[PDB]
Design a protein around this ligand. Structure first.
Ligand SMILES: Nc1ncnc2c1ncn2[C@@H]1O[C@H](COP(=O)(O)OP(=O)(O)NP(=O)(O)O)[C@@H](O)[C@H]1O
Ligand SMILES: Nc1ncnc2c1ncn2[C@@H]1O[C@H](COP(=O)(O)OP(=O)(O)NP(=O)(O)O)[C@@H](O)[C@H]1O
Ligand SMILES: [Mg+2]
Ligand SMILES: [Mg+2]
Lengths: 33, 454, 454
């Protein structure tokens, strides 16, 4: 129960960190061109 | 035509995706588009199984990415290495719902990544890396960890359960033991696969359909009501890649694979040659589905006229009995290779023995270019190097001649710098090393040296 | 002409009947017309002995049927399988008055018919099946029983008395023990017989008259005052079915049959080759009437010029002494086969050794069609497939070439579906499997591939 809540919490954490890095990369490319 | 290459063809299936470069270098994460995830019924954070090349798998967590094409999959270098794939390869993907929390795992560092450090590997590297991450891992994964301005590569040596698990807070992590040799991983990294074989597209298909397909799906053949042949003879002139294909098949197949080398059997004492032979067929029988590859067949089974030894003749008799002894339920296939097919005892090419033959012949110009690409992939080439042109100037060259061409080219390139380097130095000056490259001129030189040879 | 095929001919006798399909699938019942029963002096419910192929017998109960032709016999699938016969075959029938109540019998299930069930096999299957039925059965019968929405095949493993008996109320039925492998029965089911040999009608007659006839009726020959020859050499080019005939003879003969394989004798140590040879002729002598078949004779008895080994020459000497050693009372016949008759030591073809020769040659167009029918009988063929046409386009092909043609055809058929099937799947999609069939087009393709080969 609490195990799946932990996994889900870490998975949510993962998704938001990928989203943060997508935007950083996107910004870098705009500055490049 | 398209039919004889059927079996090589990339399938337009939803779980077949093209490998592209990753945004973010988290070793356990791979990124799809959201419509792709919707299609495969994958929700954010699901655990997935990837299949790459050379029997490789990786277990990852799948995440959404709006910059990712529907037909593409983003994965960092570490995952690609574990799958033995490069950017542009196609891999297959499925849910992995069965995957349990690990009881313990054993990992060790690569040796050239640690010389020397006091630090506790668990505390400094692994605990922060795994902490509350619930990362999936597989036996044989290599992964990279950052810590305190240093990076350390680890290999997963053991998991329990095997071969994969999720590393939880309560999973015991062992990091203790002798560091893994980099050279040993570089040996494994460079196993031969099908993508190391140029110019044989049609023959790789014939082999896949006479060997892999009937060991993998014996149902197909029973359904339609036919026995697949059990003896496949590869033939062709020297250096066309028969032995290469043997190594690829060994590293790609899902069957048990037993190599017999002609000369090596023939180098044994009287009676020990026979014994080893029997043991090979016994082991394969026992471990079916299985492939026996007999490389350089002509060594052990020349025409019973050629061979003026009673033992040598006895050995051929033994082979034939072993071939015939393959009762139809064994799922054992015997491949063999030779550059002298006419030199083989004809009784071996009868029905139920080596009854199929594959010509690994001289490649054509397009094939030669494939070969040149494969061979130079790890080489430092200058921009002036036009391999297509080299392909066009190498008529009648086979794979081995193209390898040597590339060696000779390189050596010329080295020759060009011999005014800076002495035999007597212990060391090579770095700016000399980093500038070293093979030019077209070097290849031109090599080419011209090869017209004496041919 | 009609005389050289005399011995194959179906006899217009009252006890020779054509197998037709059965009204009612009771495994112990067979149906004749009433005038046929009257003719053979069989009354309703008499116990009868049927002879089918491959030495098979069945014991049945004979019943009247007004829908049955006088010249026909109705029998369900189960009985036909036990007789190794198909619809349209001719079988022989006699009263069986000698047949005793069984003291015990042992039967076991086929394994793919039972995985898994609690139930007591006796109580749930066998007691209701045998109850007050007084069924006749024979060791080696396979029979099917219904019970509670499931069907279970059993094999009769033992009877007492052997080999047949009637199962009475007081007969002990054992059903306990390890289930019988389906694959093992499918191996037996597919033993080679004479009906698996196409295009050799005249040579099967020569063999039947030089081998079966004089071992079965040595009186004929003593009456008329002549010794039958004892050495029969089959010859012909590769793949014409010499070894096939050896397997058929082994599965059809009423004699003791001992196979010697050339290469396999020749694969033995010095002295062990000789020993095995002596033991073969000793065993046959002891177990007469008997057949020794020496397959690939040329391996053990090449011209005493060819063979540069003293042991190899010693072996041939041993053969000749063993052949001559067949004193005229032994009732042992030696057959042998070779695709190289000129390569055999000529002393073996002298009087009293291999003094009769049978040419298992290249079949003609009609023969080729017979072969194609035999080979495809268990294959999934589409309706467009015209084998007569294939027969006509395969001049100079022999049996083995026709087998491979049919394999290549099938493989093309499979090739056509390779867009749905992956090497990496564990499974084959069923609608793919059920639709799989070999088309004429597939055969056309195969044919065209075979004109390089020839
Ligand atoms: N088809 C190919 N594609 C790529 N490289 C090849 C190919 N064929 C040969 N080479 C290169 O040449 C090397 C020697 O070839 P090898 O696989 O030994 O050929 P082979 O046919 O086994 N020789 P032989 O046993 O002399 O008949 C290979 O290991 C490759 O480095
Ligand atoms: N007369 C035939 N009728 C039906 N099938 C045949 C016939 N001859 C050959 N075949 C098929 O081809 C296969 C190989 O033939 P086989 O019986 O080995 O011939 P063989 O003459 O013994 N060969 P060899 O020993 O090379 O001279 C058989 O097992 C059949 O599958
Ligand atoms: Mg080689
Ligand atoms: Mg044969």
């Amino acid at each position: 129960v609490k195990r799946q809540e932990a996994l889900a919490a870490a998975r949510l954490k993962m998704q938001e960190e990928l989203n943060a890095q997508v935007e950083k990369h996107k910004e870098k490319l705009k500055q490049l061109e | 035509d398209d039919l004889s290459t059927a079996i090589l063809k990339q399938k337009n299936r939803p779980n077949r995706l093209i490998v592209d470069e990753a945004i973010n270098e988290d070793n356990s994460v791979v990124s799809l588009s959201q419509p792709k995830m919707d299609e495969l019924q994958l929700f954010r954070g699901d655990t997935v199984l990837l299949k790459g090349k050379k029997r490789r798998e990786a277990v990852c967590i799948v995440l959404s990415d709006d910059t990712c094409s529907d037909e593409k999959i983003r994965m960092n270098r570490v995952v690609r290495n574990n799958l033995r794939v490069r950017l542009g390869d196609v891999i297959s993907i499925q849910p992995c719902p069965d995957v349990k929390y690990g009881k313990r795992i054993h990992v060790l560092p690569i040796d050239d990544t640690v010389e020397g450090i006091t630090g506790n590997l668990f505390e400094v590297y692994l605990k922060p890396y795994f902490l509350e991450a619930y990362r999936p891992i597989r036996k044989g994964d290599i992964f990279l960890v950052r810590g305190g301005m240093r990076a350390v590569e680890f290999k997963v040596v053991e998991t329990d359960p095997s071969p994969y698990c999720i590393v939880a807070p309560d999973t015991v992590i062992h990091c203790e033991g002798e560091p893994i040799k980099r050279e040993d991983e570089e040996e494994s990294l460079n196993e031969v696969g099908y993508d190391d074989i140029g110019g044989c597209r049609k023959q790789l298909a014939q082999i896949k359909e006479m060997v892999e397909l009937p060991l993998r799906h014996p149902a197909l053949f029973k359904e339609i009501g036919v026995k697949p042949p059990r003896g496949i003879l590869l033939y062709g002139p020297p250096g066309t890649g028969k032995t290469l294909i043997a190594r690829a098949v060994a590293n790609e197949t899902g069957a048990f694979f037993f190599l017999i080398n002609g000369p090596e059997i023939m180098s044994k004492l009287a009676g020990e040659s026979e014994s080893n032979l029997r043991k090979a067929f016994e082991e394969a029988e026992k471990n079916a589905p299985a492939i026996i590859f007999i490389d350089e067949l002509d060594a052990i089974a020349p025409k019973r006229e050629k061979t003026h030894g009673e033992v040598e003749r006895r050995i051929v008799s033994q082979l034939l009995t072993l071939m015939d002894g393959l009762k139809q339920r064994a799922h054992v296939i015997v491949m063999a290779a030779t550059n002298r097919p006419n030199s083989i005892d004809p009784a071996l090419r009868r029905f139920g023995r080596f009854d199929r033959e594959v010509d690994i012949g001289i490649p054509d110009a397009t094939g030669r270019l494939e070969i040149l690409q494969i061979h130079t992939k790890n080489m430092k080439l200058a921009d002036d190097v036009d391999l297509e042109q080299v392909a066009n100037e190498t008529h009648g060259h086979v794979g081995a001649d193209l390898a040597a061409l590339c060696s000779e080219a390189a050596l010329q390139a080295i020759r060009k710098k011999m005014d800076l380097i002495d035999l007597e130095d212990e060391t090579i000056d770095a700016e000399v090393m980093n500038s070293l490259a093979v030019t077209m001129d070097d290849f031109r030189w090599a080419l011209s040296q090869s017209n004496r040879s041919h």
